[PDB]
Each structure stands twice: as structure tokens, then as C-alpha cells.
Amino acid sequence: NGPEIMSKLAGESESNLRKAFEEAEKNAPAIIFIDELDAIAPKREKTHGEVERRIVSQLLTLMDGLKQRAHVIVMAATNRPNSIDPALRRFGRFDREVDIGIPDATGRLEILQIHTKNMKLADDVDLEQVANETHGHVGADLAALCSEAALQAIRKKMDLIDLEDETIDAEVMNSLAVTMDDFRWALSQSNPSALRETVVEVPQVTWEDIGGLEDVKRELQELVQYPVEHPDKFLKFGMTPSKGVLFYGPPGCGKTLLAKAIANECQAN
Amino acid sequence: VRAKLDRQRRVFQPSPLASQFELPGDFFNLTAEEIKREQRLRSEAVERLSVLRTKAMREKEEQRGLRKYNYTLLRVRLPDGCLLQGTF
Ligand SMILES: Nc1ncnc2c1ncn2[C@@H]1O[C@H](COP(=O)(O)OP(=O)(O)O)[C@@H](O)[C@H]1O
């Protein structure tokens, strides 16, 4: 991780970074995960000191050394893909990247279900309703919500049954169910850590959600689906598909639903 | 014609035995309901300070404490250790 390597003295940060790469080869196959890449190797054109530019050069040459270190893959994590020195993203080195972003309503439900695998939920618990309310929450926040709901169920019932000790009977644990009130309480205690960032999702809007505009709905299917569903006809007639459409008119007539509805049927973000 | 208030003049002598009591060892160990209630009252107190509301909503809550009593019981502590009580 960036800040730990950066907390070291000059010469120690470079030595520690080199050792990690040498150990990965010794233990190959291996994965080297560098967290806060923007902290360990910030843009050189955005720094001033020799040591900060030095550690960037040290990482850049170690990345190139991966052609000799067989079966070693280096992964890295940053908050913004453009906050790291552009040399790291040149052919070789970190030539692949994946945009993780923020989970959508479906992803949030999946996370809540994952962190409740062991939890006994009462019939009134509705995790889909929670996932729809938890806008701006990420997996770190949804995991906290599940653990907090579990704890509240434990304090309400089990602490009136069990001793103030480390060991609990299996039967008492299994007899506990977590109610919707315990999840809603946790929601009041938690606060989304990623509420301002843009969230990209596959919409749930379908064509039946839009009243009127029968011809516009069909027109979008022709503009968006036909160029890839029937490409041999577009080539046959030498027609260049349009890249987009602009909508105009009064507000509140369904412009957003139109774009989402075609994205929905196409299973597109 | 209205019935006259009975003063019910009485004098009492407090017994020192009423002040002799020992607590259970678990007296100071609060329960899950007492700790969750206290934390909810802290969150509600911060929320009430944050709420944007008109004077009419403020008075509706404040006015809840206005109607409980119209009589009083008075006691007088006398130099000789006796307590004098009556109704007013
Ligand atoms: N043609 C329509 N059919 C059904 N609902 C509509 C239609 N147009 C607008 N709405 C409703 O109005 C709301 C706002 O739509 P939107 O297109 O987001 O407006 P804006 O132009 O402000 O973006 C939507 O949530 C939708 O429920």
C-alpha cells in the first residue's frame, strides 16, 4: 500500500518495494496488489522532490522486470484512473484496467444477501427494500448494516439468556431471528460513503413503463438494435448507422424513460 | 355551597431506618434496552435541534406539560426534629 511504503525513509521505501517483487518471483505464481497506487506513484509532473520521482521510476522498472519474473501479475487499486503517473499505463506494465465503480440496486441486494448467509432473518425482513433505500452505499457500508442488525438482535434476546462470557450454546444462537426493525435501525446509524459519485447501472425501466410515444419507442429500437441485430442489411444497402439521437420538448414527458427502456431491453448500462 | 378543604393537620417523626438500604452488585450494569434507548434519545435530540419547523409545531409539543395539578401538600421542618404537614 502506498502510504505505508511512503512512510519509510529514503532508501527504505525503494528497498521494501523491490523485496516484494523478488518475493513474488520466489513464490510464483503470485499476485502483487498495490493499494493506493496514486499515493505510492503519484504523477511525477505533479510532485517536486527527487524521492517522490525516484519511487515512481523504481516501480516503473520493476513492472518492466515482470517479463523475467515468470507467472507474476501485479494488480493495483486507485480511486481515480487519472491520478497516477501516465507511464504506469503504457503498453506492458499496467496495460489492463477495470472500472469497479459503485454497485447498483441489484448489486447492493446481492451484497446484503452475501453478508446475511449465516443470519436467520424474520419473515418481515425485506432486503430488496433496503437495497433500494441504501443509495450511495458501497459494500463496506452494506456489510456494516448486516452486522449491526445482527448485533441488535443479539442484545435484545440473547443477552437475557446467555452469560457475559466468550462461549454461547448453539441452540440459543440458532433460536435468534433478525427483524426488519433491526435493519432499519442500522440504516439510521449508517451514512453512505459514496453518495456524490456517479453510479452506472442497467436500468429496470421497460417499454410498458412509458405511456404514449408508441412510434418513438419503435424508432429507438430501429436506431439502437437493428445496426447489430441485422448488420448484413446495413452493409448490403451501404447505410451508415446513426451514432445517437437528441430529444427535445417539454420536461416530464418521458425522455429519461426512453433512454432507459432501450438500455433495459438491450441489457446495457 | 361548596365543601371546605380539609387541611388534615398531621405531625410526623421520620425513622432513621428508612435510609438504610444496600444496592445489588449488578445495580450499575445497564441493559440492552436502557443503552439503546439512551442512544436513540441522543440521536433524536440532535435531530430535533436540526429540524426546520414553525412556532405552531414547537408549541404543540411544549403545551403537553401544562395541565396536571390544582392542589398542593406542604410540609414544614421544625427545629425540634418534627415534620408538620397539611393540604392547601
Ligand atoms: N410518458 C411517460 N409515461 C409515464 N411516466 C412518465 C412519462 N413521462 C414522465 N413520467 C414520470 O415523470 C417522472 C420524471 O420523468 P423524467 O423523464 O425524469 O423527467 P425529466 O425531463 O425532468 O428528466 C418519471 O419518474 C416518470 O415516472
Cell output for B3: 365543601
SS (H, E, C) chain B: CCCCCCCCCEEECCCHHHHCCCCCCCCCCCCHHHHHHHHHHHHHHHHHHHCCCCHHHHHHHHHHHCCCCCCCEEEEECCCCCEEEEEC
Where does residue A18 rank: exposed (0-12), middle (13-18), buried (19+ CB within 10 A)? middle
Rounded to whole angstroms, how far apart are CA atoms A155 and A143?
19
Quote the CA–CA distance of B74 and B86 in Å, as a whole number.
6
Q: Do B43 and A152 touch (CB under 8 A)?
A: no
The set of residues, in sequence order, having a beta carbon less than 8 Å from that of A172 and lying 6+ positions away, is A158, A161, A162
Report how far residue A24's alpha carbon sits from residue B46's, in angstroms, rounded to the nearest whole number: 52
Mutate to test the interface with A, among B26, B35, B36 (most CBs of A within 10 A): B36
CA A152 to chain centroid: 28
Distance from C-alpha of A104 to C-alpha of A201, rounded to nearest angstrom: 6
In angstroms, the CA A136 to CA A196 distance is: 7
Angle at A132 between CA A126 and CA A134, to 5 degrees: 100
The rounded distance, in Å, linking the Cα atoms of A32 and A73 is 6
Q: Is A132:A155 a contact under the CB 8 Å cutoff?
A: no
Examine residue B16 and say whether the peptide bond preceding it is cis (omega within 30 degrees of 0). no
Fold classification of A103-197 is Helicase, Ruva Protein; domain 3 (1.10.8)
Q: Say how many Å lie between the CA of residue A255 and the centre of ligand 1.
A: 7
Q: What's the resolution in A? A: 3.3
Print the SS3 string covering chain A: CHHHHHCCCCCHHHHHHHHHHHHHHHCCCEEEEECCHHHHCECHHHCCCHHHHHHHHHHHHHHHHHHCCCCEEEEECCCCCCCECHHHHCCCCCCCCCCCCCCCHHHHHHHHHHCCCCCCECCCCCHHHHHHHCCCCCHHHHHHHHHHHHHHHHHHCHHHCCCCCCCCCHHHHHCCCECHHHHHHHHHHCCCCCCCCCCCCCCCCCHHHCCCCHHHHHHHHHHHCHHHHCHHHHHHCCCCCCCCCCCCCCCCCCHHHHHHHHHHHCCCC
Contact assessment for residue A115 and residue A147, using Cβ atoms and an 8 Å cutoff: yes
The answer to whether the CB of A20 falls within 8 A of the CB of A32 is yes
Calpha distance A185→A190 (Å, rounded): 9
Other C-beta atoms closer than 10 Å to the C-beta of B13 total 7
Maximal C-alpha separation, chain B: 58
- Nearest-Cα residue of chain A relative to residue B39: A189
A151 contacts chain B (CB < 8 A) = no
Q: Can you tell me the distance from the alpha carbon of A37 to that of A77, in angstroms, rounded to the nearest whole number? A: 6
- Indicate yes or no: CB of A156 within 8 angstroms of CB of B43: no
Sole residue written with cell 449488578: B26
Closest CA to A51 of A12, A89, A87: A12
Binding residues of A for ATP: 79, 115, 252-257
**Residue where the block lists cell 445489588:** B24
Residue A19 CB: number of other CB atoms within 10 A?
Answer: 10
Residue A64 to residues A71, A72, A137, A257, Cα–Cα distance (Å): 14, 12, 38, 48
C-alpha A178/C-alpha A117 separation (Å) is: 12
Note whether A156 contacts B32, CB cutoff 8 Å: yes
Q: Please enumerate in sequence order all residues whose Cβ is within 8 A of that of B41, keeping only pairs 6 or more positions apart, or say none.
A: none
Distance CA A80, CA A102 (A): 13
Phi-psi domain of A66 (left: phi exceeds 0; alpha: psi -120 through 50; beta: other) = alpha
CA distances from A146 to A78, A109, A189, B23, B35 (A): 27, 12, 12, 38, 20
Give the bridge partners for B84, in sequence order.
Answer: B11, B76
* Residue corresponding to grid cell 493495483: A76
Which amino acid does the sequence have at A53? R
| Cα–Cα dist A134/A145, whole Å | 10
Give the residue from A37, A6, A32, A38 showing the smallest Cα distance to A19. A32
**Separation of alpha carbons A150 and A161, rounded Å:** 16
